[PDB]
């Protein structure tokens, strides 16, 4: 075929019932994730080719960067609850990997503040049980697929994107192939 299992994607031997339709995992410590977000804009180019009616979900993971890694998953929960993902994603990446000014939970907080979220609102969210359960959801989904690496994308809880098996000579062509594969898998 043109899309072969084991080539542009792999199939989970343990399919995950009721999983989000498009599920992406990342870490603000993950160098390829930085690329995926700020250079390739993967999430965006997938959405642009997804059918109508398919929701897109993106979760942070704990297994990189120790304590600060967990702080970032809780902050990503805050980001999701307040709907401010598009305002903090870039400074979190650059704060962690570019400028290295993120060294503590308080430095993570500064990014939200600088992005215009108010102190009280952040701290209230940070401490809220809605955020606790949003953290739990992020962990459960990563648990459900044995996740030990990022970036990672899963479609319908059955198929996992395999970027190692796509041409990387051209970044535009890589992204289109990636997105087209998600669309294929999505219609499967």
PDB file of C-alpha atoms in Angstrom:
ATOM      1  CA  UNK A   1       0.000   0.000   0.000  1.00  0.00           C
ATOM      2  CA  UNK A   2       1.129   3.609   0.243  1.00  0.00           C
ATOM      3  CA  UNK A   3       0.534   3.814   3.992  1.00  0.00           C
ATOM      4  CA  UNK A   4       1.896   0.634   5.567  1.00  0.00           C
ATOM      5  CA  UNK A   5       1.668  -0.242   9.208  1.00  0.00           C
ATOM      6  CA  UNK A   6       5.228  -0.197  10.515  1.00  0.00           C
ATOM      7  CA  UNK A   7       6.097   2.632   8.121  1.00  0.00           C
ATOM      8  CA  UNK A   8       4.344   6.010   8.563  1.00  0.00           C
ATOM      9  CA  UNK A   9       2.622   4.641  11.644  1.00  0.00           C
ATOM     10  CA  UNK A  10       2.417   1.610  13.951  1.00  0.00           C
ATOM     11  CA  UNK A  11      -0.575  -0.166  15.438  1.00  0.00           C
ATOM     12  CA  UNK A  12      -1.098  -0.523  19.169  1.00  0.00           C
ATOM     13  CA  UNK A  13      -1.420  -4.197  20.069  1.00  0.00           C
ATOM     14  CA  UNK A  14      -3.398  -2.881  23.031  1.00  0.00           C
ATOM     15  CA  UNK A  15      -6.028  -0.580  21.519  1.00  0.00           C
ATOM     16  CA  UNK A  16      -7.280   2.120  23.910  1.00  0.00           C
ATOM     17  CA  UNK A  17     -11.090   2.372  24.120  1.00  0.00           C
ATOM     18  CA  UNK A  18     -12.759   5.797  24.336  1.00  0.00           C
ATOM     19  CA  UNK A  19      -9.464   7.599  23.708  1.00  0.00           C
ATOM     20  CA  UNK A  20      -9.478  11.141  22.265  1.00  0.00           C
ATOM     21  CA  UNK A  21      -9.633  11.123  18.484  1.00  0.00           C
ATOM     22  CA  UNK A  22      -6.333  12.890  17.951  1.00  0.00           C
ATOM     23  CA  UNK A  23      -4.055  12.682  20.971  1.00  0.00           C
ATOM     24  CA  UNK A  24      -0.617  14.351  21.067  1.00  0.00           C
ATOM     25  CA  UNK A  25       1.968  14.137  23.879  1.00  0.00           C
ATOM     26  CA  UNK A  26       4.823  16.507  24.494  1.00  0.00           C
ATOM     27  CA  UNK A  27       7.212  17.897  27.078  1.00  0.00           C
ATOM     28  CA  UNK A  28       8.601  21.405  27.329  1.00  0.00           C
ATOM     29  CA  UNK A  29      11.980  19.655  27.910  1.00  0.00           C
ATOM     30  CA  UNK A  30      11.741  17.686  24.668  1.00  0.00           C
ATOM     31  CA  UNK A  31      13.941  19.095  21.864  1.00  0.00           C
ATOM     32  CA  UNK A  32      11.953  17.530  18.993  1.00  0.00           C
ATOM     33  CA  UNK A  33       8.760  18.884  20.602  1.00  0.00           C
ATOM     34  CA  UNK A  34      10.263  22.361  20.449  1.00  0.00           C
ATOM     35  CA  UNK A  35      10.899  21.798  16.756  1.00  0.00           C
ATOM     36  CA  UNK A  36       7.355  20.346  16.296  1.00  0.00           C
ATOM     37  CA  UNK A  37       5.822  23.428  17.800  1.00  0.00           C
ATOM     38  CA  UNK A  38       7.876  26.431  16.782  1.00  0.00           C
ATOM     39  CA  UNK A  39       9.515  25.296  13.554  1.00  0.00           C
ATOM     40  CA  UNK A  40       7.129  22.753  12.035  1.00  0.00           C
ATOM     41  CA  UNK A  41       3.816  23.807  13.615  1.00  0.00           C
ATOM     42  CA  UNK A  42       2.664  20.197  13.420  1.00  0.00           C
ATOM     43  CA  UNK A  43      -0.424  20.520  15.614  1.00  0.00           C
ATOM     44  CA  UNK A  44      -1.592  23.329  13.434  1.00  0.00           C
ATOM     45  CA  UNK A  45      -1.029  21.695  10.115  1.00  0.00           C
ATOM     46  CA  UNK A  46      -2.771  18.496  11.271  1.00  0.00           C
ATOM     47  CA  UNK A  47      -5.858  20.456  12.366  1.00  0.00           C
ATOM     48  CA  UNK A  48      -5.916  22.223   9.013  1.00  0.00           C
ATOM     49  CA  UNK A  49      -6.399  18.883   7.231  1.00  0.00           C
ATOM     50  CA  UNK A  50      -8.564  17.072   9.763  1.00  0.00           C
ATOM     51  CA  UNK A  51     -12.224  16.431   8.821  1.00  0.00           C
ATOM     52  CA  UNK A  52     -15.017  18.422  10.435  1.00  0.00           C
ATOM     53  CA  UNK A  53     -16.068  17.150  13.848  1.00  0.00           C
ATOM     54  CA  UNK A  54     -12.738  15.729  14.993  1.00  0.00           C
ATOM     55  CA  UNK A  55     -11.483  17.198  18.303  1.00  0.00           C
ATOM     56  CA  UNK A  56      -7.754  17.622  18.869  1.00  0.00           C
ATOM     57  CA  UNK A  57      -6.192  16.942  22.291  1.00  0.00           C
ATOM     58  CA  UNK A  58      -2.626  17.709  23.497  1.00  0.00           C
ATOM     59  CA  UNK A  59      -1.109  16.601  26.832  1.00  0.00           C
ATOM     60  CA  UNK A  60       2.145  17.278  28.730  1.00  0.00           C
ATOM     61  CA  UNK A  61       4.154  14.419  30.291  1.00  0.00           C
ATOM     62  CA  UNK A  62       6.038  13.929  33.574  1.00  0.00           C
ATOM     63  CA  UNK A  63       8.924  11.665  32.622  1.00  0.00           C
ATOM     64  CA  UNK A  64      11.307  14.442  31.508  1.00  0.00           C
ATOM     65  CA  UNK A  65      12.924  17.066  33.723  1.00  0.00           C
ATOM     66  CA  UNK A  66      12.112  15.596  37.112  1.00  0.00           C
ATOM     67  CA  UNK A  67      10.399  17.972  39.532  1.00  0.00           C
ATOM     68  CA  UNK A  68      10.129  20.830  37.101  1.00  0.00           C
ATOM     69  CA  UNK A  69       8.677  18.350  34.589  1.00  0.00           C
ATOM     70  CA  UNK A  70       5.771  17.643  36.958  1.00  0.00           C
ATOM     71  CA  UNK A  71       5.356  21.356  37.615  1.00  0.00           C
ATOM     72  CA  UNK A  72       5.010  21.827  33.864  1.00  0.00           C
ATOM     73  CA  UNK A  73       2.266  19.174  33.591  1.00  0.00           C
ATOM     74  CA  UNK A  74       0.337  20.959  36.335  1.00  0.00           C
ATOM     75  CA  UNK A  75       0.922  24.282  34.524  1.00  0.00           C
ATOM     76  CA  UNK A  76      -0.238  22.783  31.273  1.00  0.00           C
ATOM     77  CA  UNK A  77      -3.409  21.720  33.189  1.00  0.00           C
ATOM     78  CA  UNK A  78      -3.794  25.403  34.239  1.00  0.00           C
ATOM     79  CA  UNK A  79      -3.185  26.444  30.636  1.00  0.00           C
ATOM     80  CA  UNK A  80      -5.990  24.074  29.479  1.00  0.00           C
ATOM     81  CA  UNK A  81      -8.464  25.122  32.164  1.00  0.00           C
ATOM     82  CA  UNK A  82      -8.036  28.836  31.399  1.00  0.00           C
ATOM     83  CA  UNK A  83      -7.885  28.250  27.639  1.00  0.00           C
ATOM     84  CA  UNK A  84      -4.562  30.049  27.398  1.00  0.00           C
ATOM     85  CA  UNK A  85      -2.539  27.353  25.607  1.00  0.00           C
ATOM     86  CA  UNK A  86      -1.746  29.604  22.632  1.00  0.00           C
ATOM     87  CA  UNK A  87      -0.333  32.325  24.876  1.00  0.00           C
ATOM     88  CA  UNK A  88       2.067  30.266  26.996  1.00  0.00           C
ATOM     89  CA  UNK A  89       3.242  27.467  24.713  1.00  0.00           C
ATOM     90  CA  UNK A  90       5.934  29.518  23.032  1.00  0.00           C
ATOM     91  CA  UNK A  91       7.405  31.220  26.160  1.00  0.00           C
ATOM     92  CA  UNK A  92       7.353  27.958  28.078  1.00  0.00           C
ATOM     93  CA  UNK A  93       9.423  26.274  25.336  1.00  0.00           C
ATOM     94  CA  UNK A  94      11.842  29.190  25.037  1.00  0.00           C
ATOM     95  CA  UNK A  95      12.017  29.635  28.790  1.00  0.00           C
ATOM     96  CA  UNK A  96      12.977  25.990  29.226  1.00  0.00           C
ATOM     97  CA  UNK A  97      15.196  25.345  26.180  1.00  0.00           C
ATOM     98  CA  UNK A  98      16.281  28.707  24.695  1.00  0.00           C
ATOM     99  CA  UNK A  99      16.876  31.233  27.461  1.00  0.00           C
ATOM    100  CA  UNK A 100      16.850  28.784  30.378  1.00  0.00           C
ATOM    101  CA  UNK A 101      15.079  31.188  32.704  1.00  0.00           C
ATOM    102  CA  UNK A 102      12.638  28.566  33.907  1.00  0.00           C
ATOM    103  CA  UNK A 103      14.101  26.868  36.954  1.00  0.00           C
ATOM    104  CA  UNK A 104      11.216  26.696  39.385  1.00  0.00           C
ATOM    105  CA  UNK A 105       7.438  26.715  39.617  1.00  0.00           C
ATOM    106  CA  UNK A 106       7.617  30.461  40.256  1.00  0.00           C
ATOM    107  CA  UNK A 107       9.441  30.991  36.955  1.00  0.00           C
ATOM    108  CA  UNK A 108       6.691  29.020  35.220  1.00  0.00           C
ATOM    109  CA  UNK A 109       4.162  31.321  36.904  1.00  0.00           C
ATOM    110  CA  UNK A 110       5.998  34.463  35.598  1.00  0.00           C
ATOM    111  CA  UNK A 111       5.333  33.293  32.032  1.00  0.00           C
ATOM    112  CA  UNK A 112       1.591  33.245  32.627  1.00  0.00           C
ATOM    113  CA  UNK A 113       1.742  36.629  34.380  1.00  0.00           C
ATOM    114  CA  UNK A 114       3.765  38.094  31.538  1.00  0.00           C
ATOM    115  CA  UNK A 115       1.200  36.615  29.148  1.00  0.00           C
ATOM    116  CA  UNK A 116      -1.499  38.558  30.963  1.00  0.00           C
ATOM    117  CA  UNK A 117      -3.133  35.959  33.186  1.00  0.00           C
ATOM    118  CA  UNK A 118      -3.643  37.464  36.636  1.00  0.00           C
ATOM    119  CA  UNK A 119      -1.840  36.235  39.731  1.00  0.00           C
ATOM    120  CA  UNK A 120      -4.937  35.379  41.742  1.00  0.00           C
ATOM    121  CA  UNK A 121      -6.454  33.640  38.744  1.00  0.00           C
ATOM    122  CA  UNK A 122      -3.346  31.576  38.130  1.00  0.00           C
ATOM    123  CA  UNK A 123      -2.820  30.596  41.771  1.00  0.00           C
ATOM    124  CA  UNK A 124      -6.541  29.737  42.183  1.00  0.00           C
ATOM    125  CA  UNK A 125      -6.433  27.569  39.040  1.00  0.00           C
ATOM    126  CA  UNK A 126      -3.050  26.061  40.083  1.00  0.00           C
ATOM    127  CA  UNK A 127      -4.605  24.943  43.345  1.00  0.00           C
ATOM    128  CA  UNK A 128      -8.036  23.938  42.018  1.00  0.00           C
ATOM    129  CA  UNK A 129      -9.400  20.384  41.972  1.00  0.00           C
ATOM    130  CA  UNK A 130     -10.476  20.897  38.352  1.00  0.00           C
ATOM    131  CA  UNK A 131      -6.736  21.244  37.657  1.00  0.00           C
ATOM    132  CA  UNK A 132      -5.978  18.177  39.805  1.00  0.00           C
ATOM    133  CA  UNK A 133      -8.325  16.087  37.690  1.00  0.00           C
ATOM    134  CA  UNK A 134      -6.944  17.646  34.513  1.00  0.00           C
ATOM    135  CA  UNK A 135      -3.441  16.505  35.670  1.00  0.00           C
ATOM    136  CA  UNK A 136      -4.899  13.033  36.342  1.00  0.00           C
ATOM    137  CA  UNK A 137      -6.355  12.898  32.835  1.00  0.00           C
ATOM    138  CA  UNK A 138      -2.943  13.735  31.344  1.00  0.00           C
ATOM    139  CA  UNK A 139      -1.305  10.980  33.347  1.00  0.00           C
ATOM    140  CA  UNK A 140      -4.019   8.402  32.671  1.00  0.00           C
ATOM    141  CA  UNK A 141      -3.813   8.937  28.892  1.00  0.00           C
ATOM    142  CA  UNK A 142      -0.034   8.529  28.891  1.00  0.00           C
ATOM    143  CA  UNK A 143      -0.453   5.473  31.118  1.00  0.00           C
ATOM    144  CA  UNK A 144      -3.036   4.018  28.694  1.00  0.00           C
ATOM    145  CA  UNK A 145      -0.455   3.835  25.858  1.00  0.00           C
ATOM    146  CA  UNK A 146       2.763   2.846  27.720  1.00  0.00           C
ATOM    147  CA  UNK A 147       4.247   6.183  26.815  1.00  0.00           C
ATOM    148  CA  UNK A 148       8.028   6.390  27.140  1.00  0.00           C
ATOM    149  CA  UNK A 149       8.778   8.942  24.437  1.00  0.00           C
ATOM    150  CA  UNK A 150       7.715  12.283  23.001  1.00  0.00           C
ATOM    151  CA  UNK A 151       6.601  13.802  20.695  1.00  0.00           C
ATOM    152  CA  UNK A 152       3.903  11.238  20.129  1.00  0.00           C
ATOM    153  CA  UNK A 153       0.574  11.278  18.406  1.00  0.00           C
ATOM    154  CA  UNK A 154      -2.183   8.671  18.649  1.00  0.00           C
ATOM    155  CA  UNK A 155      -5.232   8.417  16.447  1.00  0.00           C
ATOM    156  CA  UNK A 156      -8.472   6.853  17.805  1.00  0.00           C
ATOM    157  CA  UNK A 157      -6.463   5.011  20.472  1.00  0.00           C
ATOM    158  CA  UNK A 158      -5.286   2.495  17.859  1.00  0.00           C
ATOM    159  CA  UNK A 159      -2.621   4.125  15.677  1.00  0.00           C
ATOM    160  CA  UNK A 160       0.619   5.880  16.539  1.00  0.00           C
ATOM    161  CA  UNK A 161       2.458   8.270  14.203  1.00  0.00           C
ATOM    162  CA  UNK A 162       5.938   7.197  13.121  1.00  0.00           C
ATOM    163  CA  UNK A 163       7.933  10.220  11.933  1.00  0.00           C
ATOM    164  CA  UNK A 164      11.236   8.277  11.759  1.00  0.00           C
ATOM    165  CA  UNK A 165       9.820   6.762   8.575  1.00  0.00           C
ATOM    166  CA  UNK A 166       9.166  10.001   6.632  1.00  0.00           C
ATOM    167  CA  UNK A 167      11.537  12.154   4.515  1.00  0.00           C
ATOM    168  CA  UNK A 168      13.209  14.946   6.488  1.00  0.00           C
ATOM    169  CA  UNK A 169      15.152  16.679   3.668  1.00  0.00           C
ATOM    170  CA  UNK A 170      12.373  19.245   3.334  1.00  0.00           C
ATOM    171  CA  UNK A 171      10.556  20.408   6.462  1.00  0.00           C
ATOM    172  CA  UNK A 172       7.414  21.465   4.589  1.00  0.00           C
ATOM    173  CA  UNK A 173       7.139  18.078   2.920  1.00  0.00           C
ATOM    174  CA  UNK A 174       7.671  16.324   6.257  1.00  0.00           C
ATOM    175  CA  UNK A 175       4.786  18.217   7.874  1.00  0.00           C
ATOM    176  CA  UNK A 176       2.403  17.607   4.972  1.00  0.00           C
ATOM    177  CA  UNK A 177       3.241  13.923   4.995  1.00  0.00           C
ATOM    178  CA  UNK A 178       2.739  13.847   8.742  1.00  0.00           C
ATOM    179  CA  UNK A 179      -0.602  15.653   8.561  1.00  0.00           C
ATOM    180  CA  UNK A 180      -1.812  13.609   5.581  1.00  0.00           C
ATOM    181  CA  UNK A 181      -0.998  10.464   7.551  1.00  0.00           C
ATOM    182  CA  UNK A 182      -3.123  11.638  10.472  1.00  0.00           C
ATOM    183  CA  UNK A 183      -5.964  12.338   8.020  1.00  0.00           C
ATOM    184  CA  UNK A 184      -5.584   8.876   6.485  1.00  0.00           C
ATOM    185  CA  UNK A 185      -5.507   7.232   9.902  1.00  0.00           C
ATOM    186  CA  UNK A 186      -8.451   9.314  10.995  1.00  0.00           C
ATOM    187  CA  UNK A 187     -10.624   8.086   8.125  1.00  0.00           C
ATOM    188  CA  UNK A 188      -9.518   4.491   8.669  1.00  0.00           C
TER     189      UNK A 188
END
